[PDB]
Paper text:
We used single-particle cryo-electron microscopy (cryo-EM) to determine the structures of GPI-Tsub and GPI-Tprod to 3.22-Å and 2.85-Å resolutions, respectively. As expected, the main difference lies in the catalytic site. Despite having a higher resolution than GPI-Tsub, the ligand density in GPI-Tprod near the catalytic dyad was broken between the ω- and ω+1 residues, indicating the production of CSP. For GPI-Tprod, consistent with the purification results, densities supporting a GPI-AP with the ω, ω−1, and ω−2 residues were evident. Additionally, the CSP, the other product, was visualized in the structure. To reach the catalytic site, this moiety may undergo a “fishing rod-like” movement, as illustrated by the superimposed GPI-Tprod, allowing its nucleophilic attack on the carbonyl carbon which is once more polarized by the oxyanion hole (Step iii).
Many eukaryotic receptors and enzymes rely on glycosylphosphatidylinositol (GPI) anchors for membrane localization and function. The glycolipid is then added to the proproteins by the GPI transamidase (GPI-T), a transmembrane complex composed of five subunits: GAAP1 (Gaa1p), PIGK (Gpi8p), PIGS (Gpi17p), PIGT (Gpi16p), and PIGU (Gab1p) (yeast homologs in brackets).
Numbering used by the authors:
A (entry chain T): 103 to 310
B (entry chain D): 218 to 244
C (entry chain U): 2 to 421
D (entry chain S): 527 to 544
E (entry chain T): 415 to 554
F (entry chain G): 10 to 398, 423 to 481, 491 to 621
The structure:
């Protein structure tokens, strides 16, 4: 669904009203370093690039002038609890309720893959899409290895994955759902087995 | 423990100075 | 002459055979043979960058002058033919320059023999036409068949072109031609900054040839020196201004001359600047780079003081000093002043420490590839091994040049005061 | 120091001669 | 589109729009020469190597089946990450592996000795030329 | 000065003899405590940490060994389908590489003319890290009904390693085919360097920059002693840290590990200990001078990856160690290698080993070669000053010797098709016979005045000193072995004197004679004598193998010798027989 390069990756889109894109880039990189407890102050002219045809805006865009785009990546940056705690403290529930309680530092980093992302972009306020609304999307993708985590158990569970089970939804959220992929690519319209009966079953064309 | 970077005064400065001065200037 | 044609044919055949061999790729990538300012891959890269609309001087790979890019835009094909022709042309220019110099020095010797200015019994030191017959041929043979020159032209380095320019400057200076000598010296200074030091030897030889005493009270000396200096400066200014218009920008001046003077690459070479500045405290970087680039221009004035009446030996020593203390030295640069050795081989009897220094130079040269391979590819050696080889090579070069200088001084003293 | 050893000798010789 | 790097001021940037033929593997290779840096310009672990940033692959991969227009406020959050322009194509941004390359390294313990040795080599020429230019021959 | 020159003239022979004896004695003193040092760790990344081995899959390794042996017997070659299924079962990311090559001539020892094979390797992607570093555990498998236990233990180790999270580097489990040929093909394809002309399918999976490798050869259910081989291709050696890592686990696990097949205790009693030290040092010197890759690890060192070969032997010794113990040692070695935070740069890369736990660095054995080169330098100085007391006469011997060296290099590989048609000999034997014939034709000089011969001998001495020093820097053992035999005869040779004695001394120290003496010394050191007939047979086999390896793996012994050391010796031959 979402892929990120190893280490830190920061690409930003400045407004057309800005003048010193590089100065704002440096200031923003230092501020983000302070916010997320990562050594993003190492983003310099030696790391920064300006893609000419890649990394188009992910939200509503009147025009695409790449003069206002900066993209930097630090492949040796590490991610740990020192970076997850500021990330977890930016959520309204802040790991006290909802799905954020499943974010246990020990279990999340006992994984083959682990990515923490913060995306800010403008989206359509309504279906007419005549107005601008600001969206913040904080995502966390992990992959649990079948041999390391399972150790031959061959049965998966929320408790076995996160050392914690869901108890209550986040009271602030207007939608808190868990989607479990149950598609069998070879079997004739059969589905995977889930112990608790799901609320509903939803089918659509995802990733082709 | 460790070692800081310190010049080898006796080993090299003396050798590379007595390779120049007595070889060329003084005698 | 027939022997000159035979030597030219042998050299061209050897160069072509090595061009078509499988060792061309190996030679082309040698740090001793190519340099950041003279590699052929960088010429191809800078020519390819212009096809993309990118100025070749916006990167850190291309460091050659606009004249080279103009020459190799038309002559990107037949590059090996171009370099073979440049080597042959350098050989021809050196041959004729030395042939005229031999006549000039024999006329001088006959003059002081008629005036009886020499010692009563210096017959052994007297130069004879029989001994000078094959000196011009040996000068062209020590350059064409030098392994350094063969490698430098098989690798397709512009060092061969810069050597050709210096050789033509020597030829024009020896054959009068103040205008052509100034133009060729300006062209040589264009490619590398250091050859501007040859201005004093060229001026001294021109004044001696035109029979103007080099005296402070003399006015003809000042007039001729001013004409030569103005001619040189004008020929350099015109070249700079003209080659500005090739890309309509001044970015070549940094990428070439600031590169030469500031040594930003720090890439291994036979020189002494690569490690000194890799292993260096940043407190004294500016001071020591200033001192090291002063070193090249340091000896021209004191050498002119002692060698006022011997300008060609002064030019040979200056070429050797440039080749030794250049920021980015090359075996091709070293091979230019080893073409002058047959000229000064009459100094052999007064040459001490010749066998040991020649053996050291040969050992260091053969040991450059072996220790470079051990450091880089085998991984069992450090940069210290290569640094030690460069130190020994440069010490051998310095001692050899000072040894020839000492032999020259001994011969002059014996001629003046009396051999026993 | 190798630069200054012969220079000082020359200056001392000049001082003695003057 | 290619921009050249400047020492200590800019990285190399190289963007290409390649057309991958069906049922094929396309190899994109470019040559590089490792550079020797100053002894203070290396990382605290200089024998570990230097990381080359992972490459970015943007493409419109064809899809097995066509996707209907989606409503970002009535669809799962994993389906609204990227805007969809064509029904039969979806956008993917793959990142390749980081590359660990080793540069040639100086000694890191030889700044004083190298200064001494190179200065001695220079002083050899200085002293020899000074003697030859200053002193004059004498008998006995 | 003139007095110094006269003193050199008067004392050339005693000085040369004293220098040669000093070099020989300095080499023979390398095994004594003042010069030899006990090995130490010197790498804190591996010496300041410890590992607790939990390898218990000793029955899985045996079951895998039986299955692999049965499937190899059924297939008649390396079982690819079974290997790829078992690696998938244990959880590796299995791949397959198919390679092919045509040898210059039939290889009698390995019974191959055109080699086609497949390499099977599975990559254990390191969790919590990107694929940037790699460790290789390779089993050299050849058509010899061996290494099945090694393959089983490799698969069991992979199964144990797969379930762990503490891996900072990917682990490649490589099962080669056709012994070192498959390893060379895999390395060439992995690094995308076409160094030997091997044909192979493109690699689809890589594990990043390889940092260390261990080659495992094991053909028994239980071992009685582990053996470590360090000398690699072209006399190259791994970092001493890898050897110290291997040796430090013998004490930990109570294992009995030997170097060169010799177990040298730490008693170092002056009566017997230096003799075993000298035996091991001489075996190492000969093995390093041969320049051939003795195990699969030898081909790894060319790519700046430190490699080791751990053979297992079952040799009647009562205390038989277990496959579990061997697996524990391998697991500890790989875990400590994983503890490395950078490439191995500490310890040493140029050394000699007079024992498993003793070493001599380059600054302590270099005088042995330098003293021998001092003889050549002194003789060259003497000849120079005697000359100071002829282009035409020199150019003919120089060109003839260089041309005959070039013919010795180029002709034998070709002409086998031509020679076999006319002569009742095989394609492989024709190469060796042509080598010998050209070697003798060099002795039979066609073309054949003091200054001429002094000049030629001076040139030859300078050339020989250059070659000996340059070889000694890259391969000390080869340089020392060549110097010890050629320096005394090169110095002694001159037309005025006993010509028969000088010719005998020159022939008996020619590179072919040096190779024969090296083979005899090697067999004598292995406590296995040689008669003249079997010694000649082994010499012919060595010639064939040395010619073959130059093409197959890129060994420098054949080209270096036949192009530089043979013409240089022919120069001394022409000096002895001057016009
Ligand atoms: N908790 C607690 C803790 O612990 P504790 O307790 O504390 O404890 C522990 C600790 O410990 C430690 O300690 C420390 C450490 O350390 C570590 C380190 O590491 C690193 O380092 C390293 C490095 O790497 C290495 N490399 C090394 O190196 C070295 C250095 O360093 C030193 O210094 C030295 O050694 C060097 O060297 C030197 O210096 C040398 C110089 C001196 C001398 C000079 C000379 C003079 C002159 C000469 C003569 C004269 C002339 C005249 C004559 C006549 C170095 O070494 P190397 O490098 O090895 O090497 C050396 C060199 C090189 O080589 C050379 C050779 C050359 C070649 C050849 C030549 C040429 C030849 C020619 C030919 C012939 C001719 C012929 C002719 C004849 C004919 C007939 C007639 O180098 C050099 O430089 C050299 C020089 C050069 C010179 C010269 C040139 C040449 C020649 C000339 C002569 C002659 C010729 C001519 C003529 C003749 C004839 C004629 C007649 C007349 O070092 C180190 C080691 O040690 C580092 O680190 P890294 O990691 O790397 O990095 C880091 C940062 N990033 C550092 O830093 C550190 O520190 O440990 C140690 C140990 O280690 P190991 O590993 O075990 O070892 C290794 C070894 N390899 C210790 O020791 C210490 O202490 C601490 O620290 C800590 O860690 C701990 O903790
Ligand atoms: C209208 C103006 C035109 C301008 C354009 C012209 C450009 C000229 C540039 C370079 C000329 C090159 C020729 C050099 C030949 C030197 C040989 C020589 O010494 O021969 C001497 C004769 O002396 C000279 O003609 C040399 C004078 C040159 C000074 C020019 C400086 C400005 C140039 C700007 C460069 C522009 C070019 C741009 C493109 C590159 C005679 O030597 P002899 O063997 O025939 O002995 C016979 C007799 O005995 C003495 O009779 P004489 O009266 O003729 O001697 C007077 C004096 C000579 O002393 C010198 O040699 C100093 C000059 C050295 C050349 C510099 C080249 C520039 O002797 C004395 O009596 C005085 C005693 C003490 C003086 C020197 C002691 C200390 C040395 C230097 C001062 C210390 C400071 C440091 C040095 C820095 C310089 C400030
Ligand atoms: C004759 C013709 C002409 C040409 C030629 O021949 C033909 O001439 C020949 C001749 O001319 C040769 C030279 C002669 C002189 C030689 C000098 C020699 O250096 C000395 O070499 C000794 C060898 O025993 C010692 O060095 C040890 O070398 C071991 C390897 O062989 C290391 O193993 C050990 O260091 C280890 O370090 C880690 C510790 O845990 C270990 O216990 C310790 O074993 C080193 O010894 C260490 O050497 C260091 C210097 O590099 C320090 O001195 C250190 O001391 C420590 O210092 C600490 C404080 O700083 C203190 O707390 C601690 O207690 C001390 O232990 C000392 O242990 C000694 O040391 C060191 O000097 C150098 O290698 C080579 C050398 C140039 C030779 C090179 C080759 C030549 C030119 C030959 C050449 C061909
Ligand atoms: C190809 C890659 C690496 C190759 C390395 C080789 C490069 C070496 C090139 C140049 C090094 C030379 C430096 C010193 C040159 C000396 C110049 C010179 O001519 O001095 C001459 C003196 O020559 C010498 O003394 C040097 C000779 C002694 C040692 C050299 C000979 C042995 C070396 C050979 C080794 C290789 C042999 C292989 C086959 C040739 C003067 O001679 P002359 O005056 O004509 O005598 C008559 C008197 N009236
Ligand atoms: C006659 C014509 C030519 C003759 C010879 C030509 C070929 C010679 C070429 C190479 C021979 C030189 C041998 C290289 C010496 C290597 C020694 C070395 O590097 O040691 C290293 C340390 O060395 C040093 O400290 C300084 C080394 C200075 C070397 C100076 C002498 C080298 C050559 C001198 C003359 C050689 C023989 C000459 C005879 C004709 C590593 O030391 P270590 O043992 O690992 O560490 C232990 C504690 N520090
Ligand atoms: C010639 C210059 C001096 C260097 C001499 C060093 C040679 C040391 C000889 C033996 C000790 C190291 C050899 C141990 C490696 C394996 C043991 C062995 O006996 O291999 C022996 C291999 O011998 C060698 O490889 C010696 C090196 C080859 C040199 C050939 C170069 C040709 C140039 C000739 C021009 C003159 C026999 O091979 P094999 O019969 O196929 O082995 C049985 C296989 N089932
Ligand atoms: C093709 C291999 C030629 C070896 C030498 C034949 C020439 C004989 C003439 C003089 C011998 C003096 C030099 C002997 C020193 C040993 C040379 C040596 O081992 O370094 C070799 C390269 O070193 C050189 O460049 C030596 C060339 C200097 C002479 C021209 C290693 O090459 P490689 O292993 O094939 O490259 C693969 C990289 N992994
Ligand atoms: C044909 C010949 C006669 C031309 C002579 C001109 C050179 C002597 C000048 C022209 C451009 C100069 C360079 C222009 C820029 C720089 C960068 C400068 O380094 C910096 O970036 C520092 C900038 C700062 O100090 O603010 C160091 C001097 C250097 C190499 C200059 C050195 C002197 C150069 C080569
Ligand atoms: C051009 C000719 C006719 C005059 C003689 C040249 C040298 C004797 C000196 C005079 C001024 C020096 C330059 C003065 C200033 C600089 C800037 C300096 O810039 C840096 O600090 C970057 C390099 C570094 O610090 O390592 C590099 C050396 C350089 C080019 C110097 C190199 C050596 C130079 C050219
Ligand atoms: C390289 C130079 C210095 C020497 C020339 C080669 C030698 C290493 C070879 C040439 C002839 C060989 C000898 C030929 C015959 C024999 C007899 C044979 O010994 C025996 O008869 C064993 C004892 C017994 O008689 O029962 C095998 C060893 C020996 C001495 C050989 C030992 C090795 C020798 C001396
Ligand atoms: Mg270290």
């Amino acid at each position: 669904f979402l892929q990120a390069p190893s280490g830190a990756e920061l690409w930003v889109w400045f407004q057309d009203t800005v003048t010193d894109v590089d100065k704002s880039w440096k200031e923003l990189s230092n501020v983000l370093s302070g916010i997320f407890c990562a050594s993003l102050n190492f983003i310099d002219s030696t790391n920064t690039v300006t893609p000419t045809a890649s990394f188009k805006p992910l939200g509503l865009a009147n025009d695409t002038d790449h003069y206002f785009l900066r993209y930097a990546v630090l492949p040796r940056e590490v991610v740990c609890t020192e970076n997850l705690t500021p990330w977890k403290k930016l959520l309204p529930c802040s790991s006290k309720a909802g799905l954020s309680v499943l974010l246990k530092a020990d279990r999340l980093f006992h994984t083959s893959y682990h990515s923490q992302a913060v995306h800010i972009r403008p989206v359509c306020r309504n279906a007419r899409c005549t107005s601008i609304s600001w969206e913040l999307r904080q995502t966390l993708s992990v992959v649990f290895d079948a041999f390391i985590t399972g150790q031959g158990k061959k049965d998966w569970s929320l408790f076995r994955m996160f050392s914690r089970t869901l108890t209550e939804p986040c009271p602030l959220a207007s939608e808190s759902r868990v989607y479990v992929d149950i598609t069998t690519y070879n079997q004739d319209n059969e589905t995977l087995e889930v112990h608790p009966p799901p609320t509903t079953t939803y089918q659509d064309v995802i990733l082709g | 423990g460790t070692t800081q970077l310190r010049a080898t005064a006796t080993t090299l400065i003396l050798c590379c100075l007595l390779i120049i001065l007595p070889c060329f200037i003084l005698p | 002459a027939a022997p000159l044609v035979l030597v030219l044919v042998v050299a061209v055949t050897v160069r072509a055979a090595l061009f078509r061999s499988s060792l061309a790729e190996f030679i082309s990538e040698r740090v001793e043979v190519v340099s950041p300012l003279s590699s052929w891959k960088r010429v191809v890269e800078g020519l390819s960058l212009l096809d993309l609309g990118v100025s070749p001087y916006s990167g850190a790979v291309f460091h050659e002058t606009p004249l080279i890019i103009y020459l190799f835009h038309f002559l990107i094909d037949y590059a090996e033919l171009v370099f073979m022709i440049t080597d042959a042309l350098t050989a021809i220019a050196l041959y004729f320059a030395i042939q005229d110099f031999n006549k000039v020095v024999f006329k001088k010797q006959k003059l002081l023999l008629e005036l009886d200015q020499y010692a009563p019994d210096v017959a052994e030191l007297i130069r004879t036409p029989m001994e000078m017959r094959y000196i011009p041929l040996k000068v062209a043979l020590f350059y064409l068949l030098n392994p350094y020159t063969i490698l430098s032209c098989v690798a397709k380095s512009t060092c061969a072109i810069n050597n050709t320019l210096i050789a033509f400057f020597i030829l024009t200076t020896i054959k009068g031609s103040a205008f052509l000598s100034a133009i060729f010296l300006a062209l040589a200074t264009y490619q590398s900054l250091y050859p501007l030091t040859l201005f004093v030897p060229g001026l001294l030889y021109l004044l001696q040839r035109q029979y103007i005493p080099v005296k402070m009270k003399s006015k003809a000396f000042w007039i001729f020196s001013w004409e030569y200096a103005m001619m040189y400066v004008g020929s350099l200014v015109v070249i700079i201004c003209l080659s500005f218009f090739l890309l309509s920008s001044w970015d070549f001046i940094p990428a070439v001359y600031g590169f030469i003077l500031s040594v930003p690459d720090l890439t291994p070479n036979i020189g002494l600047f690569w490690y000194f500045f890799a292993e260096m405290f940043e407190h004294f970087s500016l001071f020591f780079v200033c001192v090291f680039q002063i070193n090249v221009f340091f000896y021209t004035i004191p050498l002119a003081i002692k060698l006022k009446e011997h300008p060609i030996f002064f030019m040979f020593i200056q070429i050797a000093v440039i080749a030794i203390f250049k920021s980015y030295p090359t075996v091709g640069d070293v091979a230019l002043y080893m073409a002058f050795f047959p000229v000064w081989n009459h100094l052999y009897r007064f040459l001490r420490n010749i066998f040991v220094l020649t053996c050291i130079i040969i050992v260091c040269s053969l040991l450059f590839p072996v220790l470079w391979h051990l450091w880089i590819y085998a991984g069992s050696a450090n940069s210290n091994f290569f640094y030690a080889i460069t130190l020994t090579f440069n010490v051998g070069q310095i001692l050899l040049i000072s040894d020839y200088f000492y032999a020259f001084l001994r011969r002059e003293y014996y001629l003046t005061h009396g051999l026993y | 120091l190798p630069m200054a050893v012969p220079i000082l000798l020359s200056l001392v010789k000049i001082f003695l001669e003057t | 589109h290619y921009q050249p790097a400047q020492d200590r001021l800019q990285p190399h940037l190289l963007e290409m729009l390649i057309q991958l033929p069906a049922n094929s593997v396309t190899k994109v290779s470019i040559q590089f020469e490792r550079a020797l840096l100053k002894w203070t310009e290396y990382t605290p672990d200089p024998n570990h190597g230097f990381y080359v940033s992972p490459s970015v692959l943007s493409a419109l991969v064809p899809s097995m089946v066509a996707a209907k227009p989606v409503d970002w406020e009535e669809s799962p959050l994993f389906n609204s990450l990227f805007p969809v322009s064509d029904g039969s194509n979806y956008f993917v941004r793959l990142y390749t592996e980081p590359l660990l390359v080793n540069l040639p390294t100086p000694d890191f313990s030889m700044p004083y000795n190298v200064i001494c040795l190179t200065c001695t080599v220079v002083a050899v020429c200085y002293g020899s030329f000074y003697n030859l230019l200053t002193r004059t021959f004498h008998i006995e | 000065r003139r007095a110094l020159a006269r003193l050199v003239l008067r004392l050339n022979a005693p000085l040369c003899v004293l220098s040669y004896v000093a070099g020989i004695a300095w080499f023979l003193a390398l095994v004594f405590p003042p010069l030899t040092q006990r090995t130490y760790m010197s790498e804190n990344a591996m010496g300041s940490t410890m590992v607790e081995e939990q390898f218990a899959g000793g029955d899985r390794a045996r079951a895998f060994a039986r299955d692999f042996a049965a499937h190899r017997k059924k297939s008649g070659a390396l079982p690819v389908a079974w290997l790829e299924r078992t690696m998938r079962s244990v959880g590796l990311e299995v791949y397959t590489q198919s390679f092919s090559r045509k040898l210059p001539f039939p290889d009698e020892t390995h019974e191959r003319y055109m080699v086609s094979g497949t390499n099977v390797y599975g990559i254990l992607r390191a969790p919590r890290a990107a694929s940037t570093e790699s460790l290789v555990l390779t089993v050299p498998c050849g058509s010899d009904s061996t290494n099945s236990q090694a393959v089983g233990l490799l698969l069991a180790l992979a199964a144990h390693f797969r379930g762990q999270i503490y891996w900072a580097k990917d682990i490649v489990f490589l099962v080669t085919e056709h012994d070192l040929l498959g390893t060379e093909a895999w390395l060439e394809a992995y690094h995308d360097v076409n160094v030997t002309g091997m044909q192979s399918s493109p690699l689809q999976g890589r594990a990043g920059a390889i940092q260390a490798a261990v080659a495992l050869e094991l053909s028994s259910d239980v071992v009685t002693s582990l053996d470590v081989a360090v000398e690699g291709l072209n006399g190259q050696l791994p970092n001493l840290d890898l050897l110290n890592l291997f040796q430090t686990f013998c004490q930990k696990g109570g294992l009995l590990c030997t170097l060169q097949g010799k177990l040298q205790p730490e008693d170092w009693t002056s009566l017997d200990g230096p003799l075993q030290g000298l035996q091991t040092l001489l075996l190492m010197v000969l093995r390093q001078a041969s320049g051939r890759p003795h195990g699969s690890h030898g081909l790894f060192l060319r790519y700046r990856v430190e490699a080791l070969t751990l053979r297992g032997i079952n040799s009647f010794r009562q205390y038989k160690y277990d496959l579990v113990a061997v697996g524990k040692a391998l697991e500890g070695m790989f875990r400590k290698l994983n503890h490395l935070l950078e490439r191995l740069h500490q310890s040493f890369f140029l050394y000699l080993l007079p024992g498993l736990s003793r070493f001599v660095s380059i600054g302590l054995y270099m005088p042995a070669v330098g003293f021998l080169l001092l003889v050549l330098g002194l003789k060259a100085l003497e000849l120079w000053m005697q000359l100071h007391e002829g282009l035409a006469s020199l150019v003919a011997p120089l060109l003839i010797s260089q041309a005959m060296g070039l013919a010795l290099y180029v002709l034998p590989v070709l002409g086998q098709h031509v020679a076999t048609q006319h002569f009742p000999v095989a394609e492989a034997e024709a190469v060796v016979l042509t080598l010998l014939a050209i070697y003798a034709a060099g002795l039979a000089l066609p073309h054949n005045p003091d200054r001429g011969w002094m000049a030629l001998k001076l040139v030859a001495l300078i050339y020989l000193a250059l070659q000996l020093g340059c070889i000694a820097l890259t391969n000390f053992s080869l340089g020392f072995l060549l110097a010890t035999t050629m320096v005394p005869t090169a110095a002694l040779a001159k037309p005025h004197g006993p010509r028969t004695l000088y010719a005998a001394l020159l022939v008996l120290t020619s590179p072919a004679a040096t190779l024969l003496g090296s083979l005899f010394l090697w067999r004598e050191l292995q406590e296995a004598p040689l008669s003249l007939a079997e010694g000649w047979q082994l010499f012919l086999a060595a010639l064939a193998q040395g010619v073959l390896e130059h093409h197959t793996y890129g060994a420098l012994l054949f080209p270096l010798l036949s192009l530089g050391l043979y013409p240089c010796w022919l120069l001394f031959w022409n000096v002895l027989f001057w016009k």
